[PDB]
Each structure stands twice: as C-alpha cells, then as structure tokens.
Amino acid sequence: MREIVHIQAGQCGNQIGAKFWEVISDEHGIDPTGSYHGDSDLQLERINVYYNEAAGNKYVPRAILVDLEPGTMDSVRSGPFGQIFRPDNFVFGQSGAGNNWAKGHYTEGAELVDSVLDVVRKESESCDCLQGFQLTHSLGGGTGSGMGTLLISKIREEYPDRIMNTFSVVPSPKVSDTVVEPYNATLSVHQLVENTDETYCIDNEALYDICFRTLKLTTPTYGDLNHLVSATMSGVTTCLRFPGQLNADLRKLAVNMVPFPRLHFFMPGFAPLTSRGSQQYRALTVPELTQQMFDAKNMMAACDPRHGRYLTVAAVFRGRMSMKEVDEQMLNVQNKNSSYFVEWIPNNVKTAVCDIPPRGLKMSATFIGNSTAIQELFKRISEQFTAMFRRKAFLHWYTGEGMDEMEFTEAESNMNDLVSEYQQYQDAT
Amino acid sequence: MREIVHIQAGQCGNQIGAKFWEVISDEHGIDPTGSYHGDSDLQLERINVYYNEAAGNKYVPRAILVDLEPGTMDSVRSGPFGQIFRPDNFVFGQSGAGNNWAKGHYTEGAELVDSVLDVVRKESESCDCLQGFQLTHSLGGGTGSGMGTLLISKIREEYPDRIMNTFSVVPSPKVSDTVVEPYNATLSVHQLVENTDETYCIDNEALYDICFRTLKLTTPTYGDLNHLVSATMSGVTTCLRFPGQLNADLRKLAVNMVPFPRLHFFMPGFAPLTSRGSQQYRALTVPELTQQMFDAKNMMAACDPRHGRYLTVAAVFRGRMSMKEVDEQMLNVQNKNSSYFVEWIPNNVKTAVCDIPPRGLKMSATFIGNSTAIQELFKRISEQFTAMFRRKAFLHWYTGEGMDEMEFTEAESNMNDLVSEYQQYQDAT
Amino acid sequence: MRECISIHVGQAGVQIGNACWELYCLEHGIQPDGQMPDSFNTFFSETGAGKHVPRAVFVDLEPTVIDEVRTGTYRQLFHPEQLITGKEDAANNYARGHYTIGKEIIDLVLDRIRKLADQCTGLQGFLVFHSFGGGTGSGFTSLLMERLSVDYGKKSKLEFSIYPAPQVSTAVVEPYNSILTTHTTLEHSDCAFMVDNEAIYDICRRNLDIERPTYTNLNRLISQIVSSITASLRFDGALNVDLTEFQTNLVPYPRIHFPLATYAPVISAEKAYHEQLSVAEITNACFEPANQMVKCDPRHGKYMACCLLYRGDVVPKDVNAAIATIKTKRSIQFVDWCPTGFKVGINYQPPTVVPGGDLAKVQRAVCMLSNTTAIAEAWARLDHKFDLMYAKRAFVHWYVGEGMEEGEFSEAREDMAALEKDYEEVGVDSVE
Amino acid sequence: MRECISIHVGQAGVQIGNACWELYCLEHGIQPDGQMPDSFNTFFSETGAGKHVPRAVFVDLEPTVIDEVRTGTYRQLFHPEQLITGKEDAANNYARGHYTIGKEIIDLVLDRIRKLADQCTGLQGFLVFHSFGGGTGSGFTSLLMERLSVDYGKKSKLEFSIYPAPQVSTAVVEPYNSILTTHTTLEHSDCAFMVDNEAIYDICRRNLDIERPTYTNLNRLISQIVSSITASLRFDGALNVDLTEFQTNLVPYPRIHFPLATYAPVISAEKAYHEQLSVAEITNACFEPANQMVKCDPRHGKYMACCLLYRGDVVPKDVNAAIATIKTKRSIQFVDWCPTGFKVGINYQPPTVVPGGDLAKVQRAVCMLSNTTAIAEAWARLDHKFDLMYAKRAFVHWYVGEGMEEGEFSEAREDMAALEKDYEEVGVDSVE
C-alpha cells in the first residue's frame, strides 16, 4: 500500500527522474526490461509504491513524464532504462515551453494538462491506498515552472488530503542559466506556497561544489549531479519501502518538518560522500555521517545554514546501525550548535532509521533541513525580480500570453510575505 | 586515549615528519598501506594516539601537512609511506612563503590558516580525550616560521589547556642557510614564548657533527639527519604509547621541565649512537647510555652545556633495564657535575623508563635538557638581528607586507627579556 | 517533429544557404543526392524512398545566383519548385523589392511556404536569411515579413541580417535600404541577428590566418552560427534551448530585438594545436571585442542579455566556472535592471568541419548571441549616413518612381530616431 | 602547477631563448615537435594531445631573428601567435623602443601575456630576457616592465640583462640605452641578474679551452644559469627555492637589486677527467674573481648576499663544509650589517648536456647569484661613458626626434648618481 505517482516536468525533471528510476530499479533489483532479478524478498515486499506489476511478472514504473518539447522524451526512451516505462505515460507537446512560465501555465500547458490529468487519474485509480504524489522539475525553466505548477494546482483540487512533495531545482546565486529565471521562479513560488505540503529546494551551484570539493570530480556532468539528487530522492522514502527500526514516511517527514503551512521549503543533504581514493581513508560510523551532514558544504541548496536557524531537521538513516549511537549524535549537534537551532522548538531533530543500506554502501544518511537560511534564497530572487520588473523588462512575452502586471505584483508580494515570516521566526523568542 | 595531532609546517617540517611517520609506523608494525602487520598486541594497545583507525582495519596517521608551495607535498605523496596519509590533510598553497615571515603569518598564510584549522578542529573532535598537539617546523624558513607560529597562536586560543610542543629547527651558528633567518627566528621566538608549553631547539650544525664525529657518516644526507630527530621525537612520547616501569607523558615532561612559563626552550639528545663498525666494540649498558648523553658532543642544539647550568633534565629510557642501575647513574652525574647543574633545584633529573626498545636495539635513551646554555643560542640571534635591524636592511620585504618597525622592536626586546632571565637563574643562588 | 523552415532572400541569403545546407548534409550524413547510407526532421522532410529534401525556400528576383544552385553540386538535393526566381532584380532599390518586382512573385513564395507548413506537424518558426544592403534582401524580405505576420503571427520569426559595415560598403544606397527595411520589419520580426562583413574580414585575417578570404569563407562562419543556434533541435543536448526561448531570453522590449552573433573558437589547423581550448578559454574569447562579428565596441555599451550556446565535449560545472568570472570583470558591464544576464545551452554534438573549410576540427564551441547597448552606435552611424544623403534628396527619384512616397522616408527616419532613443532610455540606470 | 612565463625581448633575448628552450626540451624529454615518447608544468602548457608548448613570448621589433625561429628546428614547438614581430627595429634607439615603434605592438604583446596568464593557475612571475645595448632590449622592455607592473604588480619579475662590457662594446650608443633603461626598470623590476659578454668570452677561452667562441656558445652558458635558477620548480630537490625567495634573499634595499650570476663547473671533455669536482671544489670556483660572468672585481667590493644553487649529486653536509671555509677567507669579505650572507638551494637533478655543447657532463653544479658592492664600479664606468657623450650632446637628436625630452637625460643621470651613492651608503660600516 501507500503508492506514489511520480511526475516529471521539464527537461530537468526528466533528466533527474531518468536517473531516479535508475536508482529505484537498482534498489529493487529491476532489470532494464522490468522483470525482477534481485535476491532478497525485502525488495518485493513494498514493490508496489513505485511500481505497477504488469502481466508476465514485469514491473513498470508509476512515472508520468511531461514535457512541451519531444526532445527530452527521445533521450529517455532511447537511453538505458527507457524501455521500462509505459509508453502511455509519455505525454509530450510539440512546441516547447519557450522558456516561458505563461506559455507553460496558460497557453501550451493548458492544452496538454488534460492529457496528463487523465493519466494521473488513471494511475490514481489503480492504486490501492494512495500515499501522495511527487513532482520533479525546475523553477527557471518553462515546462518545469509553468506546466509543473499547473499540475500541482489541478491535482490539489482533486486530491486535497494527499501529500505533494516537489523536488524543485532552484536558480543558483552566481550564474544565471536563464535570463528570465527571476520571472519563472517567482511565478512558481506563488504556486508552491499554496499547493504543496513540502518542497525541496536544490541549487545547481551547490551540487557543483559537492562534486568538486567533496567528491573530487574535476569534470562532473549532469548525470553526476542527478545521481546526487536521486540518492536523496530515494532516501526520503526509504523507510516507506523497506523495514526499519524507526520507520518514517512522507507524512511523518511532513508533520515533523512543517510547523507553519507556508514554511515548507527544505534544503536536502546526503552522506556519505567520498572520492574514489579517499574512501579507504575514512571509517563509516554514525558520528562521521552526522558531522558530514550538519555543516554548510554538504547542503544541496546554495545557502549557508550559519546565516540562519534550523526550525526542524530530519535525518533519515539507512543501514544496520545502533540507535544509541544515532541518538547521541543528534543530541550532540544540538548542544554545541544551540545557537544554530531555533530555541522555541525543543529537540527539533526527526530521526528515521531504515534497515536497508544503498547499493554498495555499509550505511548512509539523508539530511532534510527546514531552516531560515533559505530566506537568503528568496531575498536574492525577489531582488532580482524587482530589479527586472521595475523597468518592465521581458514583460511583453508574458503580458502577450494573457497575463497582466497584477499577477507579478501579487507574486512578488507573496514572496516578501514569505521572507518576512522566515525573518520573524528566526528572531522570535 | 590521549591522542596527539601532529602538524607539519614548512619544507623542513614535512621532511622531518615524513621520516617521523616512518619511525612510528615501524614501531607499531604499520605497512605502507596503513594496515597492521606487527606481531605483538602491545603495538595496538595505544595505537590511537598517532592513528585513526579507518574502515577495513587500516590505520591512518593523525598528521596535518601544511605548506605554502606544492613542491613538498609531491615529495611526500610520491615517496614511501606517502599513501598512508589522508589526502584531506594535505593543505597546501600555491605561492610559496617567499622565505618571509610576513608572507607566512599575514598575507598568504592567513588565507590558508582557515583551511588548516577546519582540519585541526575536525581531527580534534574525532579524538576521545585530546592530549595535545605537536608541531614540526623551522625558524629560518617562511612557512615553518610564519605559517607555523600562526597555527600555534590560533590553536592556543581554541585549546588553552592542552600542550603545544614544537620541534623547531633553529638557525645554526656557523653557516647561515637563509639571509633573513635572524629576522625569521626572532619574529617566531616572539610567538613561541607566549603560546607553547615547551619547545625543542634543534640546530643543523649540531646534527652535522653527530653524523660525522659520532656516527662516522662522511656523507650524511638530510634523511640521515631526520632519522636522528625522528628517533628523538618518538622517544619523548614512548611512555605514552607503551607500558613502562615508570611512565611519563607530554605533561610529566612539561611539569618537571618548566620551572618558569617562559623558560621552556629545550635541547634534545639521543643515545646510543654507534657506527656500523664501532657497534660491536661497545656494550649497551645504562652507565654507557648515561655518559653518552650528558656530554656536549651529543646535544642536538649547537651550544655547549658547560657554558651554562641545567635547570631541569629529562632522560627517557627505553628497553628492559633495571631501575637501580638507572637511579645510580642519574645520581652519579649530579655528584661529579654539581657545578654543571643548578643549585636551588635539588635532584633536577626526571626519569622515565619504557619497557619497549626501538627497533633493532636492546635499550635506548632520550635526553631532554633545559639548560641556561641556550642563552648563547639567543645571544647570537639577537646580535645577528640587531646588526641587521640597525641599518633596516631587508626590512621592506616585511614592512611592505603590512608590518611596522614596532613589531621588530618588541620582538627583539622580548628576546632580550628572555636572555636576561636565563642569565638571572644561572647566577641565582 | 520540431520542424523549422528557412527562407533565403537576395544574393546574400542564397549564398549563405549554399554553405548552410552544405553543412547540414554533413552533420546528418546526407549525400548531395538527398540519400544517406531520425534527428533530421527539423530541417529535412523525407520522401517515400530514402531521399531527404530540405525545408528551404530560396528566393531571388534575379536568376543568376539560383541557377548556380540549380546546376551546382546540390542540384539533386533541392525541390525545384522551392528555388524561386524572378526576371529582373530589385537592383538595390527597396521600392522595387517591395512594390514593383516584389509584388509579382510574393504570392508564389507564400504558396511554397504554405506547402511546407502543411507537411510540418510541429512548425516552430522561420529563419529568414537576408541582407540590409541589397534591394531584394531589404525590399522583398520586408514584403515577406508583413505577409508571414498576417498568415502565422505567433510563429517565432528569426532573421539573420548582413548588417552594413561602417567603412566597408559595397553599394551606394545601403543607408537607404537599411533604414527602409528596418522600419518595416520592426513590428513584424521577433529577433534579428546582426552580422557584419568587415568584422568577419577581420576574423578570417587575424584568427584564421587567411590573407585573402572570399565570400565563400565568410559564409562558412555564418553557417556555423546558425548550426549552433539550431543545434538543440537537431541533436540531443544536456541543456536544450528552442527557437521560442531565444526571443524570450534576448528581447526585453519589443522594439529592441537586435543581438549580435559571436562564434568561438575560430582557428586554423596550425593553431588547432598550441592551445587546449577549455570552455573558459573560448568563453573569454567571445566577450573580447575583437572576436565579435559586428563592428561595434561592446566596451562602449552595456550587455542587456547574453546567450552562450555551447556544444561538444562541454562539462556544465566548468561552464559556471567560466561565466562567474565574467560577471566579476569590469570591462564586461551589464545594465542596472539586469542582474541575470545569461542563457546557457549545452549540446553534446561537436561542430563538424566541412572539407575545404578553414576552421579546425574542435571538440567544443560557443555561439554568443549578445543583446547589447553598443549597437546604438551602429544605428547612430547609419542615421548619420541617412541624414547626409536625404538632406540633398539624392537617389529619391529612383524610389519615388517605383511606388513610394517621399514622406515615407521621413516616416522611417522619425521612427529610427525613436528607436535610437530607446537604447538611451534602457542604457541609463534606475533612480532610487 | 607553479607556472612561470618568460619574455624574450630584442635579438639578444631571442637568441638566448633559442638555447634555453632547446635546453628545457632535453631536460624533460620533449621532442622539437612538442611530443614526448608531470614536472614540465612550470614552463610547458599541454594541449589535448600529447603536445607540450612553451610559456614563452618572443618579441622583436625586426623580423629577422624571429623568422629563423619560425623556420628553425623548433618551428613546430612554438605557438605561432607567441612569436611577435614588428616591421622596423628600434635600431639602438631607446626612444624608438619606448615611444615610436614600441607603442605600436605593446598592446599585442600584453594580449599574448594575458592569454598565457589566464591558463596559468599558479603563475609565480616573469623571466624577461633582454639586453641593455640594443634599442629593443632597452626600449621595449622598459615599456613592458611599466605595463606588467600595472597589470600584475605583486608578481616577481626577474630580468636577465646582458650588461655592456667596459672595453668590449658592439654599439656606440650603449651608454645611452643602458642608463635610459635602468632609470625606467628600477622602480618596476624586482631583481635583475647582470650578465656580461666579455667575461663569458674569458670563460669560454680559459675554462672551456675554445679559441673561437660564438654567440651560440655564450648562450649555452646563460641557458645553464636560468636552468639552475628554475631547477627547483621543474624538479624535486632536497632544499627547494622559489622565484619569490630570490628577491627576498638578494634584495636588501628596493633600489639595489642587481646581483651577478656565476656558474661552475665550466669544463670541457678533456678536463672532465683530471679533477674530481667536489662541492667544495666548485664552490671555491665561484668566489674566484676569474670565474664570474660580469667584468667586475669582487675583491674590490663587498658581497651583500650570495645564493648558491646546487644541483645534482650534492650532499648537504659537504655544502656546509664548503661554505664555512669561505666565511673564514679574507678575500671574500661581506658587509658589516650582514653576518648571514648565504642562501643555499640543493636539487637532485644534474645539469644535462646539450649535444654539440661545449660543457662536459658533470654530476653537480652551482649557480652563484651574488649581490655585491663591486657592481658600483660598473655603474661608475657607465656614468663616465655617459658623462663624456652627453656633455657634447652627441646622438641626442636621434632620441629627441622620436618622442623624448632633452631634460629626461639629466633626470636619468641624477637618478643614477643617486643610485651610485646607494652602494657607497651601504658599503660603509656602521657606527657604534
């Protein structure tokens, strides 16, 4: 039970998700064909959460792939693990998003959203008891920002009691990968505060540093960045798929981590992360995995946690480990960094321990941080939004698609309402 | 327990330390890989003081290697026992120190000191109960003098109750290996009197005589000089690593040898030292090891002890020996050389006896002398400093790096404050 | 399935397309016969047999340049109804291109566009290759962009203009044809990529070490620009960018849609060695003012939006390592309202080398499409070339005698004076 | 990763670099094609293939010496954009090197320096090989050292000047070019290593037993000096010394930065035997006044700082056995403020022999870089050569007519008179 429908929007969400289903198939022993080839029966005990069993003992992913251009769909279906998907799920347009929120949320995306929701509703009826939906997309693109946040608004109306966690790639501080990404992110964060139960802010600048500084990859491709996200994506739901000594699910990580219904913007983290040479020069213990998470250089969002306070922290562990060694370290980071945690939430760490490690590792972790440190994430975008909007630059590509200037004023006011809330509970005593 | 973090600064400290970890790995039976290959369990009983046990039953040194040029780091990692270190510890700059104290303590070293302290603090948290830190460097160089004394000032602020023993190669009387070594030594001795608990003054001129006169090495390389220092370095901490009939540690040799908190400048000594031919023509007895230490020609500092008085003397012994034969000889040198010891400290010899000898030897010693004979060590440098500073020669390479002439006047006054103190307690009755 | 048809107007348009469609057949393995011994679909429609034909409309009002295509090596490649000729050229006359000769076959060209657009299931937009100097490239294009904006409207219509050089001009009435074509195509084109001849004269001399470059050599470099722009449609890339995304990221205001193309590396075989050509090395090549392909000083202006279109063995981490240095540099300054001034596209395919080409086989490249304030000095020159000639009313009787009003010149000059102050309005900083 | 680019100005600079870069390819096994069948990185950047190219800028205002490089054996080694030529030489005219001809390509040379410095991640400093006699080596260098001190400033800029001999001069206006280049490079260079032709004429005759030595033979010995200075970067040594350490140990005052190079052993194959060449034997060779490479009497002055750069099979104990004897000798006297007057560097690599070379394959060597008071007599000669010529105002119309003021000569002479009294101020002893 507790099945999850995975939705992939944008070029980015399709490239993350094609690496995500590479991890899930490896954890459950699934071949490129779709047939089970593992050894343990613990892989098939909760196989149904990410898989529909087809006839002939084949498992197909419960993934819905959405794009507005057919270029990304050809990359999936011709690449490895592309034949595993149902060809009914590949719902793609022809025009492309045009790197535009309005062409993804109003013009081309609304023509395709009924082609997706009829597949969303078809997958949701085959599920026995639906857990909730996860969406992988970006905020700087057009399909991941426009078509993606359109799907959330149309699903939360149809499924208001379910969880809607998004794995949203957030625009980076240093480089801009899109000239209109302050416009695309701000119009999406307007949609994410009203329709998602939790949201996982990922920066490309942060994953560049982790591949360079921590993993010592001088030349990391996108597929090396996607392997970092996909190990985090499976790490959030690993106690839902495998037995553990203290199980969590997507609702336990929602209840424990969201003290206020707007404040659900998380920064992820993963441990251990070692190079090829520097893996034999380090012991894999729970105090090592703890101290690797709670620093700044292991955040997959490009914002220093030391400029803020953690409201709530979820550290989901994997592998055969002892609970005292876990519970000592979660206390240990709260003592010595008591200024770095919020005061009026005592004992703000959620602990989940699975029994199954990732492939080829002895034990692992997954950090889910809900800090006030992402107020600098939205102070930067709302500054980059206001600098562009005060001259009304690039506005006629969105005004020309049925939108007014009022939509931008309300979305920028909603973000400055949100930054004021993270500023409030950082200074609240 | 009682772990030691070894820090290596400068070209010199890296070349001494790479020979030092060659000795410690031989005493504990450690291969080039890092895996234990000894025979006795006494080697692993206190393995943790200089080693972190990694996964797969491998021991990595707790060594932090610091330089401002990458030339020395390539010599370590490509030489023998270079693959044993953690590659995280090799913290090196690109510019090189420029044979300059100010470029090591202010300009380039301050850019790199936070890269070292974050590794120092990382090693210090993995330690169960921290004993204290040892630093190997020089006083005539730029990294060993500037970057090295910068690390001591930043650690003693963070760890004020720990011991900070330095193994500092002091400039020689006869030759000068650096034109500005009166400037580099004097600005470092200003830092060593305020931030180290004990300091081991080593001269290159003295080790040349010991290799020539005593060991009959007509052609000693640096690696033969480093083998003399490394056997002394392991000899100070050998009762901390192995059982003994009268154990000492780095605190017992600190309390017994430092009567006044400025007067902590020691001269080391080692015995036995025999040639290849002249080793079968001599019996290894405790009266022979005693009389080999307390002369002048076995001091690793180039200053005659007969021109001063020993305040306190530590003679750490190794090997299965009898305590009466030890205690008779320590009395015997105090009777016949009663003018050579200070009067108002009765019985000024500290005795430590380990049970484990060095490799291939039956028994050994290690002399730690705190004499007034190193007032001639600082009378020479402060003379060479004042001769250069009175014409302000070579000053613009240090004034141009943010320093004034007041720093030189205070450091030269601090050294003449120190020489007056060794002159005081030599004549005090 | 993301089809894109291209129009080639004038002698400059066709001779560029002779290098472009030579290049596309090499990138897709297509023979000159249309044969090959599924990614071609954006520019190639396929017949029932194994013969692929291009989605190109070559139009000229004189038959000389087309009859070299009809008898060349690529005779068998092109559909012979697409190679549209007139009888007499527009002949450096905008009025003959727009009123006299252009109206005769404008219904023939639109009929051939519509037969291509019917067999396109995913038609994204148009690629109009023309020049500002010639009468056909100025007159007939401005007639054509009016008609395509009526019939299609929402399609993204990209122009690739040969902008006239300041000191190098091959015709006398180039300041007349350029102003009259820009007044017309302003409200009808969506993004027009300026390219100059004198700057590519400089690049073929300095960077390629050619003493004597031909128009054949210049059209090879402009073909590499268009092949890098349309690289994301024709090939699978790590970070793709479509034709609708260029007009979104580069056009802040509907008047200002004139970026300038810049390609790197431009090296020969003797300099194929002797440098490693990292993605940071070729990116600092683009923002260098000597390597741009429009004779303007970008140090004398501010970049409004840049578009770096990488391709080949390009690692996305070193991309960010390259671009973040450029925002620190003072010589590359942006506009106050634009903190986010980059669009990055990475493709996996290296740019291929045409045999007989003067570029070397590189592992990576970059087509910088930078919209800048520095092109206002280019229009300030061209208005000064217009205001000298029109004050004495020179050459006006050639244009009035073919269907134009004399007051229409003052209408185009007041609009261009309104266009020149738009860069001045954008280039200043914001108050408070 | 400790990269170091080198600049070669004038005919003297390039012909030294023809021997230097021949020597470096032998030390690293590099073919003349740049191939080899990880220690090269300080002077060699590597391409994508196995072809290593040098970090050298060869600049001359006449194309004759460069076209011998472009057609020589090392044609394929050098990046052809680095070999920078003019059209007309500076022609023994400082004003043509600094104002007339030098300003034309100074922006071209700095553009090629910057393309090297961008691909250097650990750029330590510069090696400017020039001469004081020629117009290019005096004029263009003094133009270049101004520009590099602006653009870089903190980089250690080492010069290797061919100082003009007292009785051997090959040009007439060498006393003019030497004073005018020294007034300019004084506040811009950090350490300039003087080398003389007449002294190496003496060494090739006496020590190498060559009756008739060429400029080819002199440039082999100056190449061994620079290869011994940069031996610690390129190779792992027992006691290493970097370019920043030379300016620290040898420059007591920012005006006085003119040491003199001295290499030993300089022997042939017939004298490769018949002596064992210990490290004490070759060290007493250096302080002997006959073996220095500047025509000065070091017995007539006081050494301020010496820098013994050993290499090869050198044992550090016998180093101290060698140097401690020299402090006892009366003929080698130091200055009163300097009791510590030695910097020692030991490398493990022996100096290699170039085939066709006149030096013998030795196991060890020494490059003594001694800063002394005895070079004040060299500037006392050169001011006396300047004061004779300028009193009659000879040759001034060649310099005024190319962009220089006549008062600028008196400005350089008063500064050199201020420089001459600096050695007198340092050479005296201290009171009390």
Ligand SMILES: Nc1nc2c(ncn2[C@@H]2O[C@H](COP(=O)(O)OP(=O)(O)OP(=O)(O)O)[C@@H](O)[C@H]2O)c(=O)[nH]1
């Ligand atoms: N870049 C480039 N420009 C060209 C080429 N051929 C012609 N031109 C330019 O085209 C401009 C004139 O336009 P043309 O195409 O020759 O004339 P047209 O467009 O046919 O109009 P007509 O005058 O009626 O013939 C000149 O300024 C040339 O610089 C070419 O092969 N490459």
Ligand SMILES: Nc1nc2c(ncn2[C@@H]2O[C@H](COP(=O)(O)OP(=O)(O)OP(=O)(O)O)[C@@H](O)[C@H]2O)c(=O)[nH]1
């Ligand atoms: N040591 C050495 N000196 C050289 C060599 N070639 C020329 N010189 C010296 O260079 C001095 C003159 O400088 P040049 O390099 O010939 O002239 P320049 O620097 O090119 O300046 P121009 O007069 O404009 O040509 C003469 O005094 C020569 O002694 C050489 O191969 N080795």
Ligand SMILES: Nc1nc2c(ncn2[C@@H]2O[C@H](COP(=O)(O)OP(=O)(O)O)[C@@H](O)[C@H]2O)c(=O)[nH]1
């Ligand atoms: N982490 C990561 N980010 C990606 C990847 N591919 C694209 N992106 C990001 O996605 C954004 C582009 O959005 P995209 O979905 O391609 O645009 P759209 O097609 O118009 O919706 C850029 O900001 C990229 O940084 C990837 O493989 N990994």
Ligand SMILES: Nc1nc2c(ncn2[C@@H]2O[C@H](COP(=O)(O)OP(=O)(O)O)[C@@H](O)[C@H]2O)c(=O)[nH]1
């Ligand atoms: N005993 C000993 N001393 C050394 C060794 N190597 C260098 N030294 C001394 O270290 C000093 C040089 O300092 P160094 O660290 O190399 O300079 P830096 O790199 O600028 O800090 C000289 O006085 C040498 O005598 C060695 O192997 N053994």
Ligand SMILES: [Mg+2]
């Ligand atoms: Mg024509």
Ligand SMILES: [Mg+2]
């Ligand atoms: Mg010359």
